[PDB]
Amino acid sequence: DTPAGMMMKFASETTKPFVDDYLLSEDVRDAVMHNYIHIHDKDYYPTKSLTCVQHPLDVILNHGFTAGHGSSRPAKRIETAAVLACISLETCQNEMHGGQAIPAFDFYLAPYVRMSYQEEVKNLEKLTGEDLSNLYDAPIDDYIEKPLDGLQGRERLEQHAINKTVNRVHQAMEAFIHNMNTIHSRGGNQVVFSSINYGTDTSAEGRCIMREILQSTYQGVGNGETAIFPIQIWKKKRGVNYLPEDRNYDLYKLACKVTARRFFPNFLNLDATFNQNEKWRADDPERYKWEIATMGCRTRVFEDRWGEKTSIARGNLSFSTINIVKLAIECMGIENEKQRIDMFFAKLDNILDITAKQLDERFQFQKTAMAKQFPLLMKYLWVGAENLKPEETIESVINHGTLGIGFIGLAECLVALIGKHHGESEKAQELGLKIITYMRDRANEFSEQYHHNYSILATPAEGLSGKFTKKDRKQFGVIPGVTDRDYYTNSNHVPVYYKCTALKKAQIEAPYHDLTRGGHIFYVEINPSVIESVVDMMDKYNMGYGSVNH
Amino acid sequence: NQRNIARKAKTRDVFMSIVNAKNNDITRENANMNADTPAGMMMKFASETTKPFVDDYLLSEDVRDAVMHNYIHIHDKDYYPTKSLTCVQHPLDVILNHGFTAGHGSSRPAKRIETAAVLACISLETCQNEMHGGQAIPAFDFYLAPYVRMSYQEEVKNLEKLTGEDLSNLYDAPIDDYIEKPLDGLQGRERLEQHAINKTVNRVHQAMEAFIHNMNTIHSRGGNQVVFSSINYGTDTSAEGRCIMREILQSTYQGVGNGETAIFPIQIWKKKRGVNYLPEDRNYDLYKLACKVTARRFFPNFLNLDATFNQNEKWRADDPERYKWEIATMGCRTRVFEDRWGEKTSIARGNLSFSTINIVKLAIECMGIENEKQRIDMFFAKLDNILDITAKQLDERFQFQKTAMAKQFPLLMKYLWVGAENLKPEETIESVINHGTLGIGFIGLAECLVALIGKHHGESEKAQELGLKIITYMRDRANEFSEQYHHNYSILATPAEGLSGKFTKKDRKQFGVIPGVTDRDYYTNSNHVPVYYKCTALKKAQIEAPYHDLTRGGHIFYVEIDGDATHNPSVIESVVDMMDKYNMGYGSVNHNRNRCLDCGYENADAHLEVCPKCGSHHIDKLQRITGYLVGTTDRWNSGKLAELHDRVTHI
Ligand SMILES: Nc1nc2c(ncn2[C@@H]2O[C@H](COP(=O)(O)OP(=O)(O)OP(=O)(O)O)[C@@H](O)[C@H]2O)c(=O)[nH]1
Ligand SMILES: Cc1cn([C@H]2C[C@H](O)[C@@H](COP(=O)(O)OP(=O)(O)OP(=O)(O)O)O2)c(=O)[nH]c1=O
Numbered sequence A: 001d002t003p004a005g006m007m008m009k010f011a012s013e014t015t016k017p018f019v020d021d022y023l024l025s026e027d028v029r030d031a032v033m034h035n036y037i038h039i040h041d042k043d044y045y046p047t048k049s050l051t052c053v054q055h056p057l058d059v060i061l062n063h064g065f066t067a068g069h070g071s072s073r074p075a076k077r078i079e080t081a082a083v084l085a086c087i088s089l090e091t092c093q094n095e096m097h098g099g100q101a102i103p104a105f106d107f108y109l110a111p112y113v114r115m116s117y118q119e120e121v122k123n124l125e126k127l128t129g130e131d132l133s134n135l136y137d138a139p140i141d142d143y144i145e146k147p148l149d150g151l152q153g154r155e156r157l158e159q160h161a162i163n164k165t166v167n168r169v170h171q172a173m174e175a176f177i178h179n180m181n182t183i184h185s186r187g188g189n190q191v192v193f194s195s196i197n198y199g200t201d202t203s204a205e206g207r208c209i210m211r212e213i214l215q216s217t218y219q220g221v222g223n224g225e226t227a228i229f230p231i232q233i234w235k236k237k238r239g240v241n242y243l244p245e246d247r248n249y250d251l252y253k254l255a256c257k258v259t260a261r262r263f264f265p266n267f268l269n270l271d272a273t274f275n276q277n278e279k280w281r282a283d284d285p286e287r288y289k290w291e292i293a294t295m296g297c298r299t300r301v302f303e304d305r306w307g308e309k310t311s312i313a314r315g316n317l318s319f320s321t322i323n324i325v326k327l328a329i330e331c332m333g334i335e336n337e338k339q340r341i342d343m344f345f346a347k348l349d350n351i352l353d354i355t356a357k358q359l360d361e362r363f364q365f366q367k368t369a370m371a372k373q374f375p376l377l378m379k380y381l382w383v384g385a386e387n388l389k390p391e392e393t394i395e396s397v398i399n400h401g402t403l404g405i406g407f408i409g410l411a412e413c414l415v416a417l418i419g420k421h422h423g424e425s426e427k428a429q430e431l432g433l434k435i436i437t438y439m440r441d442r443a444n445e446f447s448e449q450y451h452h453n454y455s456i457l458a459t460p461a462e463g464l465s466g467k468f469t470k471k472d473r474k475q476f477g478v479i480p481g482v483t484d485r486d487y488y489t490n491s492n493h494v495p496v497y498y499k500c501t502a503l504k505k506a507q508i509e510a511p512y513h514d515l516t517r518g519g520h521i522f523y524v525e526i527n528p529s530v531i532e533s534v535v536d537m538m539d540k541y542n543m544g545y546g547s548v549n550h
Numbered sequence B: 001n002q003r004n005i006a007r008k009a010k011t012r013d014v015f016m017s018i019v020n021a022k023n024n025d026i027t028r029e030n031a032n033m034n035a036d037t038p039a040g041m042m043m044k045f046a047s048e049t050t051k052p053f054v055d056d057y058l059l060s061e062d063v064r065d066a067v068m069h070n071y072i073h074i075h076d077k078d079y080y081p082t083k084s085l086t087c088v089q090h091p092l093d094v095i096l097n098h099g100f101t102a103g104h105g106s107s108r109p110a111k112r113i114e115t116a117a118v119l120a121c122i123s124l125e126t127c128q129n130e131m132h133g134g135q136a137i138p139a140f141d142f143y144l145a146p147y148v149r150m151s152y153q154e155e156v157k158n159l160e161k162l163t164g165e166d167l168s169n170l171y172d173a174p175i176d177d178y179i180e181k182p183l184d185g186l187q188g189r190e191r192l193e194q195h196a197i198n199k200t201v202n203r204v205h206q207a208m209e210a211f212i213h214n215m216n217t218i219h220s221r222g223g224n225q226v227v228f229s230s231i232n233y234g235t236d237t238s239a240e241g242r243c244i245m246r247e248i249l250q251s252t253y254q255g256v257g258n259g260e261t262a263i264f265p266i267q268i269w270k271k272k273r274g275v276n277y278l279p280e281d282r283n284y285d286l287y288k289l290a291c292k293v294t295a296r297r298f299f300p301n302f303l304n305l306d307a308t309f310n311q312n313e314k315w316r317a318d319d320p321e322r323y324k325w326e327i328a329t330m331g332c333r334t335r336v337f338e339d340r341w342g343e344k345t346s347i348a349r350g351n352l353s354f355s356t357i358n359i360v361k362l363a364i365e366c367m368g369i370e371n372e373k374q375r376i377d378m379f380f381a382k383l384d385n386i387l388d389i390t391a392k393q394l395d396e397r398f399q400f401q402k403t404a405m406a407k408q409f410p411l412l413m414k415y416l417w418v419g420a421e422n423l424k425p426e427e428t429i430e431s432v433i434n435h436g437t438l439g440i441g442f443i444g445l446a447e448c449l450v451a452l453i454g455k456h457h458g459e460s461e462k463a464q465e466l467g468l469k470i471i472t473y474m475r476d477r478a479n480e481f482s483e484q485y486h487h488n489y490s491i492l493a494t495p496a497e498g499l500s501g502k503f504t505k506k507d508r509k510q511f512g513v514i515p516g517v518t519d520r521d522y523y524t525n526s527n528h529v530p531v532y533y534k535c536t537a538l539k540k541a542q543i544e545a546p547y548h549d550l551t552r553g554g555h556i557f558y559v560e561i562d563g564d565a566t567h568n569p570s571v572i573e574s575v576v577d578m579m580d581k582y583n584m585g586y587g588s589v590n591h592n593r594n595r596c597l598d599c600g601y602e603n604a605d606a607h608l609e610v611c612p613k614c615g616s617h618h619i620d621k622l623q624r625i626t627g628y629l630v631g632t633t634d635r636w637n638s639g640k641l642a643e644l645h646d647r648v649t650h651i
């Protein structure tokens, strides 16, 4: 209803028909118009825009930035560091059509906690002329606040400086949360898709950042209201924060308490077999950038076939979802199960080939864009973009993103077309695993054939919940169990209308996480005890990403 | 059909010119929006799908007839269906004192100066997302004054916690000024007090600096409409307001980034006698600092509160507020001061929409009438008809905007508009929209008083009288329209950026190249002496002064100055003095800065080739197009780039 939202609606309504013509191939357009492929962000296709990125904030925070005429010097405080993080996210959100993430929020904001502490001790020195130079690089335990009742001497000055640092970090974290939840910067709804990942920083500064962000989340925004953005994600590592002996276990417990009330942060299990990296050393200051980072849109970019297995500075180029329920409904007419399965697999093969060709064509369209079209993404944020002239193509660096082949309604793909759904039957579970494994193998073949990074995606429900189901119900009527819910069940998820305990849901949904390298989530609807149990079952059965709601 | 195929091909070519990022008349319409970016491409697609829609469905047959015939230029056509209003002056005090709930974002009242500055930036961005024009903060010093005191009290209580003293008397104690002083030679209570000031000033130096950066960054990037920002200051004779103004001026002088010129926000100095203009006034030193900063960074511009048309009889020097009755400008040129059914105040109100009139075509159409009296009578008949058309268009847009509900603009119609607090989210804005203004514009007066009707007003006296009577007739017609349509109509010296060359192109296509009127790719800005005419600054001021009293919807006095006179700050004081003498309201001094794109080193010479710091291949040029600064010369319209190339310094 806002003028900006109306402008973006007009732009989308004048772009989607345009991309449908002269840009989509004949086969691609035929597949899209026949309710087979949903090309996500079909608007912004003419812009040659990429989907998402994990911002390397060290570059921006240490060298400033110069985007157009907007130039910022290197940060000297937490107050400026948080604002620069917000600025980077907002600026890159206007250059891309997907989420923006901070892979290491605790690692990126941590030197500036020490710089703020040094400013406090230097202000106390100029107030007192006491030459407190031994407190500059001294090791701090946790940056905690104490009443200061009877701590006279240099102890009083040290504790007062720590108190001021804690207050400054608290104000900066409140500012970051409120700016990401209040500033309406992008187009349309205007709220930036913001995510931050933290949990694996054991230093006192990172612990202070995490503690203050958790306290600010716990206190809410404004008058105790829960914050919608940024999507907070807690990185779970055994030996760092999971076991009671671990360094950041207490903060982890605190995180659970916050999830008990504000339902944030989410949890990213770095102990999953697919999320492990052989170059993660617990001592290296750069032990991040070798660990998995996830967005609120569930986009996972970890493995690269011609580079490093990292999530920083990389992202998704574009992803499109495949309607497998439609193929299953089409093959429903075969009475023999074996022939019906063979027909479904042939249809899936054809649609997978079409989707791969569509993603390749969109890649060829995007690669001709010049670096001048993305002032911040292709100058500080992408992998290798610092070696790009403004008037040269991005083809030398675009072959590092991920092409996503998404799917939806596996439970609906099985509820009545080929028997029962995977929540209630073991045969259905085996069939669903077979389908997703076939998709993953074909994605690997596509990656070899087209020289790209293809990954299977458990597409988030937002923006696609009812688009497929309405057309399927129009074409095929009300199929009992399939086209009768007004929404397709989320990908490889137990249907919400099926009453199963969290243990059974986790056991059913665990295998699909390894197959969906492009993204996945565990969803529990329901006290820190229950959150602890959810994380425990995420640990017991290999699961990448998880969240608890109400 | 062949016509349908041709139209489809034309639309496809327009939509692919945006995709391929080529310098065109559609990808350079606005020099603030970057067309290369995906957000710029989306905005251009929205503009191209909205302008034909409003032309073919929303306007009337008379309005379409005028627009297609190169007589009327409706401004911000792309935003017509959105029912958006043009501009507003922010009443920042209510936002800072009670917080705001916009969308899902809730903010509680600020407790320190940095929070206040960030909330000001947030309010400007949010209202920009709800409007299609510039965003200005009046009484910036007044609105940010209490939070300097709040920060001082926080520093005092921190020192009290550290030391255990009783600093209660240092909570509301009067302070002459917030000046940072070295703590070399004072011990005990006094030292502590000074320390608080030396911290408070620092807490104000970042908060202002951040502001200057944020408005230069959230404008450099825009998903919605770019953030056109401006602030007004100069009349707060208190320690906190003086501190705010001093920090703003110092941060602007230092620059943004690697000592570069902040393109935004546009800063305006509120010049007034008895407060900040005379040497015996309180803020004269800050006025001199403003002139010094304007010498280098071309900011702030100067607004004359002593002008006869900018005087309010409810202004008390002892009144705590004292700012509700002072005039502020939206930065580019907008002036919203008078109100026929309300209080004379610029606070929480602004322009609704405006449209420009092509007097040049009306004058050149009267080419064959050899008798000057009949020629002028015919010209005035055409002017009256077109003025009636423009008033009808403005009233039509007003009637369309009235139906907008309060939830279309969340922040604007709950905190930012006069009387918008007494509204439900679903109720319309009829009870409060009438406090806005409707602007009627004109262009090419210098190229309208020419060989068709003689020679231009920069070189003839009866030409000056003819121009004055033309503008006076337009002003009287606007007053009649205000009394007729029950609105607030005003004549506005419309800025010429996208309209610089839009009329002249069609006039060359139709009539051709007439020496002095259509021999250049642009029209001389409204009631301005030609930029291609060698005139002194004093003569230009004398010629253009009487127009400001007539054009009460907005005006500006531009002075191009050479690089040698750029350094000297007394020339800007001379410009302000000649504004004061010749009853001029708003003015600005301009000059071309040679900036290295890689570095940002902005030289002051007329022309530079390479960057002395680095040695870059080429150096771009920075100047103000019509009402705002623009970074690179490759963002200008070719019509306006021709005007820039032919500019002559006045010194
Ligand atoms: N929000 C916003 N408004 C602008 C900007 N630039 C110009 N304007 C509007 O433009 C008005 C000044 O007139 P011009 O900019 O010369 O209008 P124009 O060049 O003819 O552009 P259009 O009328 O839209 O075709 C101001 O009152 C603003 O409302 C901008 O960058 N952002
Ligand atoms: C605080 C803040 C800074 N910035 C920008 C302005 C600065 O150029 C950059 C770093 O800010 P600062 O930390 O203030 O850098 P500085 O050079 O001013 O350091 P010092 O005060 O010690 O001399 O970040 C913002 O864009 N927004 C903000 O809110």
Ligand SMILES: Cc1cn([C@H]2C[C@H](O)[C@@H](COP(=O)(O)OP(=O)(O)OP(=O)(O)O)O2)c(=O)[nH]c1=O
Binding pocket: A171, A174, A175, A176, A178, A179, A182, A221, A222, B106, B107, B108, B109, B110, B111, B112, B114, B115, B118, B119
């Ligand atoms: C500093 C800052 C605050 N805010 C928001 C967060 C707050 O909800 C609101 C006002 O914050 P404050 O008034 O500064 O914080 P507070 O009310 O909690 O004061 P205190 O700590 O003494 O109790 O402004 C931003 O959105 N951005 C910012 O940069």
Ligand SMILES: [Mg+2]
Binding pocket: A171, A174
């Ligand atoms: Mg606070």
Ligand SMILES: [Mg+2]
Binding pocket: B205, B206, B209
């Ligand atoms: Mg600073």
Ligand SMILES: [Zn+2]
Binding pocket: B596, B597, B598, B599, B600, B601, B611, B612, B613, B614, B615, B616
């Ligand atoms: Zn240089």
